[PDB]
Amino acid sequence: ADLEDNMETLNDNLKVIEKADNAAQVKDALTKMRAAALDAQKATPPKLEDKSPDSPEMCDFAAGFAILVGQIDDALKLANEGKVKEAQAAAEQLKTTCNACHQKYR
Ligand code: HEM
Numbered sequence: 001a002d003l004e005d006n007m008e009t010l011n012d013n014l015k016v017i018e019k020a021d022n023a024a025q026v027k028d029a030l031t032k033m034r035a036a037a038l039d040a041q042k043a044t045p046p047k048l049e050d051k052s053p054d055s056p057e058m059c060d061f062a063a064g065f066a067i068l069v070g071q072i073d074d075a076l077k078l079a080n081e082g083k084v085k086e087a088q089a090a091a092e093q094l095k096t097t098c099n100a101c102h103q104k105y106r
């Protein structure tokens with residue numbers, strides 16, 4: 001998909017996880033998020049469209065999602081051990097990485 005749809009997915013599923021009743025729900029959402037994270041990792045954001053893929057800015061962008069995925073995976077790992085609560089805790093922490101990048105590039 002494209003970037004906006006990716007960020008929708010990311011946002012919706014983050015709400016789901018806040019809302020989640022069991023571990024399968026959370027595993028599911030996190031899995032959806034992972035997919036979008038990775039898709040988005042190769043999109044070129046509007047604000048950066050005039051910069052070469054080489055640039056500090058574009059690399060930083062892509063690094064964002066590298067961090068984002070890693071954190072998702074830590075949460076995935078937690079939801080896999082059935083630890084719904086600690087896993088929602090980890091999703092909350094995502095919000096940091098969202099904002100940090102939104103600050104720079106949204
Ligand atoms: C899981 C955490 C994240 C959530 C919940 C999230 C959600 C959102 C939302 C709701 C929007 C509104 C824009 C729209 O829908 O049209 C948006 C836009 C945007 N986000 Fe994220 N995002 C997250 C992480 C990130 C990260 C890590 C980056 C950079 C690495 C990023 C970069 C952007 C950019 C560039 C836009 C603007 C898109 C446009 O101009 O069309 N986001 N995001």
Ligand SMILES: CC(=O)Nc1cc2cccnc2c2ncccc12
Nearest residue numbers: 053054055056057058059060062063
């Ligand atoms: C941040 C950065 O250095 N990106 C890249 C830098 C690259 C520099 C030379 C050749 N390929 C790349 C490249 N290819 C795929 C994805 C990213 C890159």
